């Protein structure tokens with residue numbers, strides 16, 4: 001009798017608002033431009049990234065930041081709703097310049113990071129690797145979708161096998177076909193990677209605090 | 225407990241090893257289906273036949289397709305496909321027609337829940353290709369609703385047993401177009417000679433339409 | 440033999456941010472040493488085997 | 489249904 | 503009156519630079535591995551330059567230095583490849599230290 | 603509409619084609 | 629149960645269908661969020677294929693009217709002595725100053741590029757800019 005009311009007031013309520021967590025304010029097109037959110041040379045272009053490329057400036061693909069903004073809005077919204085729902089978020093990246101930064105960001109927001117060599121079967125053979133009662137991640141955010149031989153990170157395919165939604169920064173040489181919420185943007189410049197980490201860390205932190213505030217209000221009201 | 229498993233092929237494949245020479249392995253194709261559209265298949269390999277059966281059965285359930293059944297008894301439209309060298313031409317049939325198709329397709333159809341269908345398999349009769357091709361076609365069949373939404377038009381079913389009554393099977397959930405689909409005088413469609421040859425009573429086969437047990 | 444404790448609670452959330460690596464202890468140590476080196480860089484035998 | 493002989497309690501039983 | 507992305511691109515410093523070949527720019531040493539100096543000049547990728555022998559001591563993390571850009575990204579396609587090989591690095595010549 | 607959108611031109615920075623030392627000499 | 633056929637449809641299409649069939653007893657946590665705020669493109673696996681024959685990419689080269697001025701300036705004078713500071717978003721180079729003066733003199737109504745280019749250089753020389761020609 002009480003569970004349905006609890007679920008409606010808490011779990012279903014946020015899903016009725018377009019921007020419940022107000023992630024719009026976290027970024028603007030100007031802020032993305034100032035972080036060099038600049039693609040690879042035209043010869044490195046992936047065919048599936050052409051819809052997101054504004055053009056080539058002297059053989060350097062320029063990502064259209066007007067699409068990035070709409071894609072990032074959806075990605076940050078989805079991430080917040082999953083953090084609000086107490087979902088396990090796993091950050092995956094094989095760029096070794098940013099492994100330390102990404103591992104700190106995960107620990108700071110109370111989530112998980114996998115910046116190391118991805119061993120075969122981490123997701124599709126987890127019950128054997130971790131244990132029969134292990135819980136897999138509910139969301140996987142790829143800050144870099146390519147491995148260190150410029151090929152798609154194996155976890156992208158494996159996440160889809162396990163029906164785990166994926167958020168991913170997809171540069172002009174990346175394949176976004178299996179990434180659920182692709183965000184076209186530069187994944188090389190530190191300024192860009194530092195912005196993504198700030199944006200996803202803030203959205204997760206905000207969502208978790210909102211869950212505590214909403215639960216607290218529901219409980220205080222329930223008693224009286 | 226809802227899903228049922230049925231073997232499709234058991235093969236004694238061999239490799240050569242330096243120490244022992246011929247090393248016998250078992251390759252097993254199985255199909256699992258609950259009878260309500262969810263069905264899959266897998267290949268299991270093991271030295272012992274029991275281990276091969278288990279591996280295939282347990283792995284098939286993690287690779288389940290969902291098959292769209294029209295009125296939960298047949299396919300939505302006729303599907304013609306080629307998977308590698310195997311040609312499968314399936315025809316939609318009315319209720320009470322039965323499963324007039326290759327024994328393996330009959331088995332898979334019972335697992336999917338299709339009761340009425342006709343299918344002719346041509347080219348190579350490889351069991352692996354047939355199964356993989358059958359699931360490829362049935363998965364890609366477009367439902368009447370998907371057609372209405374894509375075309376923005378009503379899908380009207382004309383049944384001979386119901387005379388001229390127009391039965392609307394699907395309507396466009398979004399806005400309904402006001403322009404009629406252009407009626408091409410002559411359709412530039414590729415016809416299968418075997419279909420045309422039968423419609424003209426030019427196909428004599430002593431093996432066609434033979435009386436068979438209920439399937 | 441020394442056995443490692445359960446790494447996740449009842450909710451199922453693991454207790455370590457590097458759990459999904461499979462080597463949380465090893466990689467946590469590597470992370471710590473790398474951090475110390477970074478800070479040291481920004482700030483700047485016979486018996487022992 | 490052909491019953492695959494079912495595995496017993498894992499023999500290794502670590 | 504919101505600035506469009508196209509407006510930002512047209513007036514971006516990188517656009518007005520145009521071809522990067524033989525363009526003198528100012529970088530910042532953000533990371534140092536032995537002699538190897540990793541310099542950021544505002545492009546997509548950094549440029550790696552060996553510590554000049556004349557005044558190596560001066561080059562420290564954060565020091566601003568003058569570069570002559572040669573290429574923004576070192577890429578090339580070799581026999582049989584479907585896509586360019588990329589070093590993920592810029593080609594530049596370290597001229598000296600910027601002094602105001 | 604907007605005047606800042608890129609226009610279609612032939613590469614203005616394109617360098618002239620190289621010539622062999624004997625180009626134009628009998 | 630789940631379906632590991634990552635190449636057949638999307639995670640939502642597969643998940644939705646299995647929940648409808650009753651294979652999945654409970655829909656996953658993300659299902660409700662996905663449906664409420666779906667992505668612009670459904671994530672369906674598609675194979676990249678090489679362009680053959682006359683097929684070409686639609687990506688167009690980014691050019692501007694002032695690139696003609698910049699090319700001429702760089703040829704006549706070369707790279708300015710002032711080093712480009714790309715960190716400052718408002719940084720103006722000597723070439724950019726030339727473009728601006730060139731454009732300002734275009735508004736005056738000069739119709740000859742060569743004359744207009746000469747007039748542009750003279751105005752900069754008067755303002756104290758150092759314009760050392762390659763010659």
Ligand code: FES
Pocket residue numbers: 620621622624625626
């Ligand atoms: S380049 Fe040799 S004849 Fe002109």
Ligand SMILES: [Mg+2]
Pocket residue numbers: 040171172186187188
């Ligand atoms: Mg990149």
